[PDB]
């Protein structure tokens, strides 16, 4: 049972995620091909970054989805099955004038 | 002091406005007032629990302060019931006067548009003098609207516009500002021709 | 199989999104409906394992979209399924994971 | 785990699986414990009736009705003991098989001068069949169809079903008769018998050292099968049966 | 001024810098004072200043969460230990 | 107005008649629902129906809220332990 | 050494933090008064008020669950209870 | 019937007489007496009461105004308080 210093807890990587996303939206507008390319870059870069972080016996899957901005109201559904004694998951929603993006990241432990 | 204010008379319209506005503010901040009363009784009960000997008359005053504030608030509407026929006469007088002044101001704007110095038959210097006279008249109208604004605040009218209305009011303010800028440009032209 | 999961989830997405037209008051309801129904399906499949389902909705009046994914790991156990679709008013993309509880 | 956050003193860390398709013997022993404490509660019931009769001779009506409600509650907890044991007998059903095996689970309590009997039959394999009237070894109670010409019991039981069960309950007392003792032409005798049919959910999934079922709360709620249903009663085949005991 | 808060926030239909300024105004009011009612008064001046009248704000850690928004003019966010809501209506 | 439903009602910028109407809309919403969010929602529904958009209402126990409201668009009151605020903006 | 723990609705990381807190409080402090007041002080001042905690060697209780704040455990011959209330 | 610690008026103590009487008469294990006191006092004097029962203990105050009581009966003692 990894602890505060060892359990996957969302407080560590989310500030990095938001900082990276805000830095990369500085000079881009929605365009589905490059948005897909950015999706691949986000997925593989985040996965390899966490794999190089090595939180103890944790494996992380990422969801990325970038859509052309339309300013709609949305509230998400969340339920699942877990041995989340040490496993964790979290979400994030942001809106830009050129796109909106929704991120859903889960995290499990080698039990 | 409030007990004495209710025990006296305040019939004069300025003193009448003063005591009603004070009453309204007290109602607005009686959150803070009763908060102070509760805190005072709270700390005094702490002292009593610790058993320090304090004046029993101080205790009677402390308990009766909130009770007499409630009796004071009852006396406020008791007094307002009697005053009501008097002050009301002033009230709708001010709504009607302010609304009529606004309508007459729109009519004066139409009259200024019809009778402005832009019509033919006027010399350039005479036209500029007439424009200056119209600007002075508009400044006097602004002063009159400030006096009626003091009336509106004294007679409970919503001064500001509302959402779209207030941004229209701000557009009118910007029109006045750019008129002042045009006056400054006229001064610059006066420097140029000199 | 991954294609079997894809076709079953696509069938349920057809049954859930056959004619629905956008209203957030109902869009959140459809998000909840998809989560409920696909997790119900995966619970019908439940072995001492782990199931993961996501639902995403977007509207179209001239927009575009494109998706893709790659994973890097010791590739023995875990799996992933991607199902795209579009209908009357909305694109529907649902990604399904199965995780083998070690 | 032991995580020593001192200066440098060492740590203890070790996990292991636990147990296989666990040997449940402690849980049969637990069921036996339930039975014995039911017996002891019964014994308390007789004792309290003795002292209640003492009060009846004297006239302490307050204590009389007191014991009334108390032992009524006692019988209520006895009923919870029965269905509680029923649920866990359902739970202990699966991992024990070294292969296809028998379908008996009956207990009589106590061994000497019995007061209650528990018995149950459950179908086990997909590789199973259907046969004649149910044979209960220890219960000494016989269920037969109306006529001996009938090879099996009436079809309303659902013999073709795989996930079905049936149970027998005997009691050497009459608990609820104390309430309606007024207004009667007749009086009862201390003997209560109970018969019912049951069903369950899943033939589970065996692979390796592990074995999976449905896990949620619905998997932890009883599936009562009252008999006979009106739909099967509408069938021309009468569900009446022979009872010997 | 501390600007050290890490948000746990997910609700958005509004401009982006106005999201950031809603965050910054709400947090800066708490920074500057240990006085809550004055903090709220500062909130209303500061944000009806930064993003026009009129905004209405409710601050606390016990209250329900639903309001009516001017279109693309509402932020719902959490910070520190307080749930905070900031919507434009008028 | 049952004894279990007694409340203190002293804060208002309203006409008295719809203040009286507030009693029965609260009664109807507390009869129809017991979740405070649901009671407030039904009060919001009926009240904004009868008195047009847009109203905002709140209930909580860690209160901070200071609003720029137009004239006769304010109401504040307790249901014993339950604190309720209501105004017009939108 | 390790505490016997039978209750939970509260995160594991600050379970470990509470275990180390009990370790320190037992190490330096040796009266139910000082240990209890101490643990209350640190646990409030680092996890925000208001924890209310009952420490002792023989008592019994249940009241109601407190939303994601739920613990009841044993160590040695003493027992400890911890929760939100206000 | 031992009472020396209180942050209360005195009428609720008059009620507390009988609630302690029934708490002692009905139940003995503290796990359920605590919940029983919770139900009775919450239905009579609103949420949220919280109760602790023990028979050799030392407890120091942590609460807010008029929300404390602390009493002994023989060896056993019972504690009650508002907090939320």
TrEMBL record, chain A:
One of its GO terms (biological process) is microtubule-based movement. GO terms for cellular component: axoneme; cytoplasm; cytoplasmic dynein complex. GO terms for molecular function: dynein intermediate chain binding. Gene3D superfamilies: Tctex-1 (3.30.1140.40). Signal peptide: none annotated. InterPro entries: Tctex-1-like, Tctex-1-like_sf. It comes from the Eukaryota. This is Dynein light chain, putative. It comes from Trypanosoma brucei brucei (strain 927/4 GUTat10.1).
Automatic annotation (TrEMBL), chain C:
The lineage of its organism: Eukaryota, Discoba, Euglenozoa, Kinetoplastea, Metakinetoplastina. Pfam families: Tctex-1. PANTHER family: LIGHT CHAIN, PUTATIVE-RELATED, T-COMPLEX-ASSOCIATED-TESTIS-EXPRESSED 1/ DYNEIN LIGHT CHAIN. It comes from Trypanosoma brucei brucei (strain 927/4 GUTat10.1). This is Dynein light chain, putative. GO terms for biological process: microtubule-based movement; microtubule-based process. GO terms for cellular component: axoneme; cytoplasm; cytoplasmic dynein complex. One of its GO terms (molecular function) is dynein intermediate chain binding. InterPro entries: Tctex-1-like, Tctex-1-like_sf. It comes from the Eukaryota.
Automatic annotation (TrEMBL), chain D:
It comes from the Eukaryota. Belongs to the DNAI7 family. This is IC97/Casc1 N-terminal domain-containing protein. The gene is Tb04.5E12.1080.
Automatic annotation (TrEMBL), chain G:
The keyword Cell inner membrane does not apply. It comes from Trypanosoma brucei brucei (strain 927/4 GUTat10.1). GO terms for cellular component: axoneme; cell tip; ciliary basal body; cytoplasm; cytoplasmic dynein complex; flagella connector; microtubule; microtubule associated complex. Pfam families: Dynein_light. The keyword Cytoplasm applies. Coiled coil: none annotated. The lineage of its organism: Eukaryota, Discoba, Euglenozoa, Kinetoplastea, Metakinetoplastina. This is Dynein light chain. One of its GO terms (molecular function) is dynein intermediate chain binding. One of its GO terms (biological process) is microtubule-based process. Belongs to the dynein light chain family. Keywords: Cytoplasm, Cytoskeleton, Dynein, Microtubule, Motor protein. SUPFAM superfamilies: DLC (SSF54648). It is found in: Cytoplasm, Cytoskeleton.
């Amino acid at each position: 049972r990894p602890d505060h210093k060892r359990k996957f807890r969302p407080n560590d990587i989310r500030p990095v995620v938001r900082s990276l996303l805000e830095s990369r939206l500085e000079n881009e507008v929605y365009k589905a091909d490059e948005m897909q390319s950015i999706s691949k870059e986000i997925a593989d870069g985040v996965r390899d970054r966490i794999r190089s972080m090595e939180l103890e016996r944790y494996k992380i899957m990422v969801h990325c989805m970038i859509g052309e901005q339309r300013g709609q109201g949305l509230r998400a559904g969340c339920k699942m099955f877990w041995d989340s004694d040490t496993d964790d998951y979290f979400e994030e929603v942001y809106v830009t004038q050129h796109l909106f993006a929704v991120v859903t990241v889960f995290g499990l432990y080698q039990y | 002091r409030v007990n004495q204010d209710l025990e006296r008379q305040c019939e004069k319209i300025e003193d009448l406005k003063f005591v009603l506005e004070v009453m309204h503010d007290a109602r607005a901040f009686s959150l803070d007032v009763e908060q102070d009363i509760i805190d005072i009784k709270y700390i005094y009960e702490s002292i009593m629990h610790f058993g320090v000997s304090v004046d029993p008359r101080e205790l009677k005053q402390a308990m009766d302060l909130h009770d007499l504030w409630e009796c004071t608030l009852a006396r406020v509407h008791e007094t307002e019931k009697a005053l009501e026929p008097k002050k009301m006469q002033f009230r709708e007088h001010t709504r009607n006067e302010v609304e009529n002044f606004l309508v007459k101001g729109k009519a004066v704007l139409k009259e200024f548009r019809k009778k402005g110095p832009g019509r033919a038959g006027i010399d350039l210097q005479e036209g500029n003098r007439l424009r200056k006279e119209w600007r002075e008249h508009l400044v006097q109208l602004q002063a009159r609207r400030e006096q009626l604004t003091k009336a509106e605040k004294l007679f409970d009218l919503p001064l500001t516009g509302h959402t779209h209305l207030q941004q229209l009011n701000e557009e009118l303010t910007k029109v006045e500002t750019v008129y002042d800028l045009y006056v400054q440009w006229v001064a610059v032209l006066k420097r140029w021709n000199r | 199989n991954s294609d079997v999961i894809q076709e079953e989830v696509a069938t349920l997405l057809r049954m859930k999104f056959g004619q629905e037209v956008w209203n957030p008051r109902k869009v959140d309801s459809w998000v909840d409906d998809v989560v409920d129904s696909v997790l119900k399906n995966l619970t019908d499949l439940k072995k001492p394992f782990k199931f993961v389902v996501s639902c995403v909705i977007m509207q179209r009046t001239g927009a575009a979209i494109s998706t893709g994914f790659i994973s890097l790991w010791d590739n023995t156990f875990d799996g992933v399924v991607h199902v795209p679709y579009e209908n009357e008013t909305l694109h529907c993309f649902v990604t399904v994971f199965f995780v083998k509880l070690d | 785990i032991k995580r020593d956050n001192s200066n440098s003193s060492l740590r203890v860390h070790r996990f292991h699986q636990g147990e296989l398709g666990i040997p449940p013997a402690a849980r049969r022993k637990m069921l036996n414990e339930e039975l014995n404490r039911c017996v002891m509660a019964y014994d308390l019931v007789e004792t309290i009736r003795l002292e209640a009769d003492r009060c009846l001779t004297l006239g302490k009506t307050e204590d009389l009705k007191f014991f009334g409600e108390n032992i009524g509650n006692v019988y209520e907890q006895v009923m919870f003991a029965f269905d509680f044991v029923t649920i866990h007998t359902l739970l202990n059903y699966d991992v024990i098989l070294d292969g296809p095996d028998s379908e008996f689970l009956t207990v009589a309590v106590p061994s000497a001068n019995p007061v209650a009997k528990f018995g149950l039959w459950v179908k086990v394999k997909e590789t199973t069949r259907s046969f004649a009237s149910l044979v209960f070894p220890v219960v000494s109670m016989r269920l037969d169809p109306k006529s001996s010409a009938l090879p099996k019991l009436p079809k309303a039981l659902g013999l073709s079903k795989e996930n079905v069960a049936l149970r027998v309950i005997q009691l050497r007392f009459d608990p609820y008769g104390c309430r309606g003792s007024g207004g009667r032409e007749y009086y009862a005798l201390p003997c209560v018998i109970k018969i019912d049919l049951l069903s369950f959910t899943e033939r589970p999934k065996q692979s390796g050292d592990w074995l999976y079922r449905s896990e949620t709360e619905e998997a932890h709620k009883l599936h009562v099968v009252p008999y006979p249903p009106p739909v099967l009663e509408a069938t021309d085949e009468n569900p009446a049966l022979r009872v010997s005991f | 001024m501390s600007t050290d808060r890490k948000a746990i926030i997910k609700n958005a239909d509004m401009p982006e810098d106005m999201q950031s300024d809603a965050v910054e105004v709400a947090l800066q009011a708490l920074e500057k004072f240990n006085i809550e009612k004055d903090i709220a008064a500062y909130i209303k001046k500061e944000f009806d200043k930064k993003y026009q009248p009129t905004w209405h704000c409710i601050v606390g850690r016990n209250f329900g969460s639903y309001v009516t928004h001017e279109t693309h003019s509402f932020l719902y966010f959490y910070f520190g230990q307080v749930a905070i809501l900031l919507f434009k209506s008028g």
